[PDB]
Amino acid sequence: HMERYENLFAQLNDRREGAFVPFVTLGDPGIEQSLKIIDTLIDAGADALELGVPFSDPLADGPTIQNANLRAFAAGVTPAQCFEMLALIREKHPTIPIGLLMYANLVFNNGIDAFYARCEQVGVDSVLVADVPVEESAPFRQAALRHNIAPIFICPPNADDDLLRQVASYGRGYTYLLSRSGVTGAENRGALPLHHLIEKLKEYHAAPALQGFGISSPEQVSAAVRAGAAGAISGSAIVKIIEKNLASPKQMLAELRSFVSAMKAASRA
Amino acid sequence: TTLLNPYFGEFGGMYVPQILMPALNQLEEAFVSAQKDPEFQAQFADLLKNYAGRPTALTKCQNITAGTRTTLYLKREDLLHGGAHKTNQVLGQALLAKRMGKSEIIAETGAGQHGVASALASALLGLKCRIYMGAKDVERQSPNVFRMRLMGAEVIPVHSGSATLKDACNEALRDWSGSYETAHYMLGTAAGPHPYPTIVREFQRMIGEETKAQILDKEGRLPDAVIACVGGGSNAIGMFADFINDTSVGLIGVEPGGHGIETGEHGAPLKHGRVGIYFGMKAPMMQTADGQIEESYSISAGLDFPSVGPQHAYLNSIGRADYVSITDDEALEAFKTLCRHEGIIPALESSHALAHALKMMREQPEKEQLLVVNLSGRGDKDIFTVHDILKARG
Ligand SMILES: Cc1ncc(COP(=O)(O)O)c(CN[C@@H](CO)C(=O)O)c1O
Ligand SMILES: O=P(O)(O)OC[C@H](O)CO
Ligand SMILES: [Cl-]
Ligand SMILES: [Cl-]
Ligand SMILES: [Cs+]
Fold this sequence. Notes:
Largest interface: A-B, 39 and 34 residues
Largest sheet of chain B: 6 strands, mixed
Radius of gyration of chain A: 17 Å
GO molecular function, one term (chain B): tryptophan synthase activity
Cofactor (chain B): pyridoxal 5'-phosphate
Order of helices and strands of chain B: EEHHEEHEHEHHEHEHHEHEHEEHEHHEH
Helix content of chain A: 40-55%
Strand content of chain A: 5-15%
Function (chain B): The beta subunit is responsible for the synthesis of L-tryptophan from indole and L-serine.
Pathway (chain B): Amino-acid biosynthesis; L-tryptophan biosynthesis; L-tryptophan from chorismate: step 5/5
Strand content of chain B: 15-25%
Radius of gyration of chain B: 20 Å
Distance between the termini of chain A: 30 Å
Structural class of chain B: alpha/beta
Subunit structure (chain B): Tetramer of two alpha and two beta chains.
Bound molecules: the ligand Cc1ncc(COP(=O)(O)O)c(CN[C@@H](CO)C(=O)O)c1O, SN-glycerol-3-phosphate, chloride ion, cesium ion
Strand order of the largest sheet of chain A: 5-4-3-2-1-9-8-7-6
Number of domains of chain A: 1
Number of domains of chain B: 2
Number of helices of chain A: 12
Strand order of the largest sheet of chain B: 3-4-14-9-10-13
Oligomer: heterodimer
């Protein structure tokens, strides 16, 4: 059991820093271009990664990520190829925490327990299953704990107390704090004084809280840390830069670098 | 925790994002409450009788069974307002929405039949209705789309994914996740996340209850078997429900065979698929070896769901109900046969159920058997499709 999340947060704490975590779809817009997009993200200052595996029916994603899956699907990407990518990424960056954004069927397809064994074999640190709520999570988190994978659980803005004590006790690595309602998109931002949620998450000894959904400006990364969160996740913002610069591979990485440099800078003491 | 069991054996569950769980737990409490409320039942019963046309007929088919020992009755859900059984449960679901204070209605549709029933229910009960439909379905169901729009509904084409029914199902749950505080998602079949399989069953169970009463009256006995086609399972579990504890009664569900099970181009996940997790439930599915959900195929646009209701998968596993398939050609022939000999134009969907009943009759013509077929819809929507088929040959 590596402790890549536990350590990153300890280090960031001693530097009174916040975490910035970009999301991308694996193989968007192609395996090789995706591999060097992730390399540009880590180099530009990303503290951790959340990576999506293309799925045919992403019922939790808005249009931006929906396009990313189809771009990836037009390239021949498979769950098998994605695991070869995850292995290469770990071989290049030993310390960065890598989390998977998964849809349930890809995990359940040929055995929940075999999917989490593969993640451990390739160096994946955490797995969030978008369509498995806490009430249905038992076989997933049990399989994840048996393979030293942290199960990530979404804490929505409408959460009551029983949920928060469940999320605090079942989850490891980090807690996904939803900014708003609905699905994925940089379009809709709009936090809901998460302050109190973050306090009882801390009161219930939950894993550090990362806020996600709608985070597209460095002022949001700053505000989130000040609210009590340990950092921010931003997905569609990254994916939109890729989508905009498809015919310009060298300028795509250039703006990708300048965006991560901005959000990461918004996170430090 | 829930008030009701979300599982039929290993099948079912509530596999939705965490944000949608309060919406589901709210829907379940409204349902359990409305089921104990006599003034809810009175209102429901009244819309079914005086607006929808219940009870529907149970028609005997002397002509089609001549020369054999089979007696065939048709449950005439084709005579229901809207032309299909879909109307039964949208009236109950729309009353559930108002009971929760909801103002808007979200719906998914493939053949357009559920979209039309959702629209008519919304027009009647003063609800603003928006309907999602794959862009490939919209182009192919311009009649039903126009009907939906005539009835005040917003038809939103979905270009995501493969632009068919499973993609409209995705867009409705996406919509619902942000709008659930004002809107109700009116799922169109006995599938999806709990409490929908339970709710859709209980709102379609008058089909079987009426059939039991009407057959005890006309024949003095229970049927040997009731036969229904299975897209998502709405009309089939509606017929099965009141008979599940009458263990002497056979329960036969017919999945679309497409061009043939051997050809891979079918829509029979219950018997020829693999259990997966999608649309908020654990159920058999049409999927790649990778776990990507693919499409069904059928000549019948209404049997295009890529999965099946979990209670059907459960009833299959304990051996209580049996599930067969019927190819496109078999359905077209049953379609032709009911037109010429009983003067009823069935839906291509229900033609699958009838085609299996004709097979039970024809393969063993001396078998004494009392059969009931659920005629889930009328076939006026399919005469164009049937025309182009037999124009391409003779
Ligand atoms: C007349 C008729 N009979 C049967 C079915 C199958 O639905 P069921 O298997 O859930 O009963 C349908 C499906 N119609 C659904 C599925 O596409 C719709 O959205 O329009 C139908 O239109
Ligand atoms: O796209 P976002 O920034 O709204 O967040 C969703 C991420 O892509 C996944 O966590
Ligand atoms: Cl009548
Ligand atoms: Cl006879
Ligand atoms: Cs089906």
